[PDB]
Every structure is written in C-alpha cells, then in structure tokens.
Design a protein around this ligand. Structure first.
Ligand SMILES: Cc1ncc(C)n2nc(CCc3nc(N4CCCC4)nn3C)nc12
Ligand SMILES: [Mg+2]
Ligand SMILES: [Zn+2]
Length: 313
C-alpha cells in the first residue's frame, strides 16, 4: 500500500512528455504502465497483485507481430497517460480507470492483418463480427482476461460502476477502428465550430474519447523523427506481408500493402499525414488545448517526410 513504483530520473521526467519512447527494455514496460496508473488514477485504483496478474495475461495475449504487439499496447497507453495528465479535471474517476486499461487491451490477440484481409480470407472472426472485426475481438479478449481467477481489477466497483467502465472500454476499443474515425472527427469538427459541443452530454464525451483513442493509436507520428521513421518500417512489414497474402488469394492488394511500391512510401506517408493524422490532432487540440504538442510533433514529422521526398534525406 505504501509501495510506489519509481523510475530512473530520465524516465521519471521524460514519461510526462507526449513524445516519450518507452525504450527497448521489454521487462521495464509493466513497471512503466503501473507507474502511469498510480499517477493518473491513484495507488488505490487497483489491487497491485490483481493489476500485475492482469498486465502479464494481457502481455501473453499479444502476438510476436512486427507492429500490433505488446510495445504498441504500452506506447498507446503512455500517450493516453499524457493526455489525461495534461487535462486533470476534465475526466471522471471511472474514465481514468478505464482508458489506460482500454489502451493496453485495444489490439489484444492482433494477428498482423486488417479487417479487410479477415473478410477476404473468410476467417471465422469475420462471421462472428461483420464490422470492426478485430476491434470486437480485442474487446472480447479483454472481458475473457478480466474473468480469469485473480484478474478482476474492477472487483471493488459497484455492479453499475463495473457496467459503466466496461462500456467506456468497449466504446474506446471499437473507436480504434480507423474506418469509424473519419465520420467521428467530422461530427466533432461540426459540433465544435457550431458551438453545440457539450461535455455533459454522454454521446459527445463518447465521441471525444473516440478521438483521444485514434490520437493515442496513431502516436508514432508524434515521436522524435528516428522513432517515427523506424516505427514506419514495422507498420509496412505488416502491411506488405498482408499484401503477399492478398496475392496468394489471387487479389491485387492496395498500394499501401504492395511491397513492389516501397519507392512510393514517402508520398504514402504524406497522404496519411494530410488525410488522417493532422486532422486528428487538429480537432483534438481544438477540443483539448493542452494536447497541442501532439499536433506540433505531427507537423514536424510531416515536414521530415517532405524532406525525404526532396532527397534532403
Ligand atoms: C504512420 C502510420 N500510423 C498508423 C497507420 C494505420 N498507418 N498507415 C500508414 C500507411 C500510409 C500509406 N502508405 C501508402 N502507400 C502507398 C504506396 C506506398 C505507401 N498509402 N498510404 C495511405 N502509415 C501509418
Ligand atoms: Mg487496432
Ligand atoms: Zn492499435
């Protein structure tokens, strides 16, 4: 109970910043997550023994894929931590509890393949979940792990608080389906510009948490350039293997997943920053001004991709 987690000085200071990289030491990532819960939520939020057992079962249910792996989970949780710590008073006790968990769990048992590839392969998950296929699976894996003996980190919540937190987690995880992001951000933009945006309205909160989830999920584009660039290699390592698997089914993949179009990666990154990332962080900064460092870093990384195209690197 009197047992804080503490980090070395460099990590203790830099973990507070949006651009923090959790580092290559896999065995330090659980401590980093517990540290973040203890500070964003409190030392009393979860029973340490149950939290530790839950974190280790979540880790075991991420696969050894290039991008959608345990490092991505903890990375997306850290970005959410930074958002929560810069907007202290905007969020409920249950939201602080649920959102770090949602982030850690949001790609549970990812196989390295898009919802599109499961549907073309006719994977059993695509018959059980016709839209947001992997994201319904990730939420289902989360509930499974919460129900293992000694793993119910929410056991001290009332039955109605328990239903509320699992509903915050379900919506947060579904919102990481990027097909849902475009319309979500469009509605949030209209609501903020016409001044109808209202954070006492639950359906509006749900949208704002949805956007926070997209922002955390995309946060490789907000890191120092060497982090951004090397993460991009992992993203394509997945996409190109899926492209290979599309060609095995007799289907030309989209350019994004075709390794024959390696040479076009810099231009593909531009499209992605202009169509997805910059608009995401723009709308987020309008709604939650202290998240502006995410927009600023994204714009710096867009400018680095522009430099690659100009042969200046
Ligand atoms: C950084 C990042 N974070 C998250 C996600 C989901 N993504 N997805 C991307 C891929 C962007 C992209 N690349 C291409 N190509 C066309 C031919 C060459 C490459 N098209 N597009 C849209 N980057 C990311
Ligand atoms: Mg996902
Ligand atoms: Zn993700």
């Amino acid at each position: 109970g009197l047992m804080q987690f503490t980090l070395p000085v460099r990590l203790c200071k830099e973990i507070e910043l949006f651009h923090f990289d959790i580092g290559p030491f896999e065995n330090m990532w659980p401590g980093i997550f517990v540290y973040m819960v203890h500070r964003s939520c409190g030392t009393s939020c979860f029973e340490l023994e149950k939290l530790c057992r839950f974190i280790m079962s979540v880790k075991k249910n991420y696969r050894r894929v290039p991008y959608h792996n345990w490092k991505h989970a903890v990375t997306v949780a850290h970005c959410m931590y930074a958002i929560l710590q810069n907007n202290h008073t905007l969020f409920t006790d249950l939201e602080r509890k649920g959102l770090l968990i949602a982030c850690l769990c949001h790609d549970l048992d990812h196989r390295g393949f898009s919802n599109s590839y499961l549907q073309k392969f006719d994977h059993p998950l695509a018959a059980l979940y016709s839209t947001s296929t992997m994201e319904q699976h990730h939420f289902s894996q989360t509930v499974s792990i919460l129900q293992l003996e000694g793993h119910n980190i929410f056991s001290t919540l009332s039955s109605s608080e328990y239903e509320q937190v699992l509903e915050i987690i379900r919506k947060a995880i579904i919102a990481t389906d990027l097909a849902l992001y475009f319309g979500n951000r469009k509605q949030l933009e209209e609501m903020y510009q016409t001044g109808s945006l209202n954070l006492n309205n639950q359906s509006h909160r749900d949208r704002v948490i949805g956007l926070m989830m997209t922002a955390c999920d995309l946060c490789s584009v907000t890191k120092l350039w060497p982090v951004t660039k090397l993460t991009a290699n992992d993203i394509y390592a997945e996409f190109w293997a899926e492209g290979d698997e599309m060609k095995k089914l007799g289907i030309q993949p989209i350019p994004m997943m075709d390794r024959d179009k390696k040479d076009e990666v810099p231009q593909g990154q531009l499209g992605f920053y202009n169509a997805v990332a910059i608009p995401c962080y723009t709308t987020l900064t309008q709604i939650l001004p202290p998240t502006e460092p995410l927009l600023k870093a994204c714009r710096d990384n867009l400018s680095q991709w522009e430099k690659v195209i100009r042969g200046e690197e």
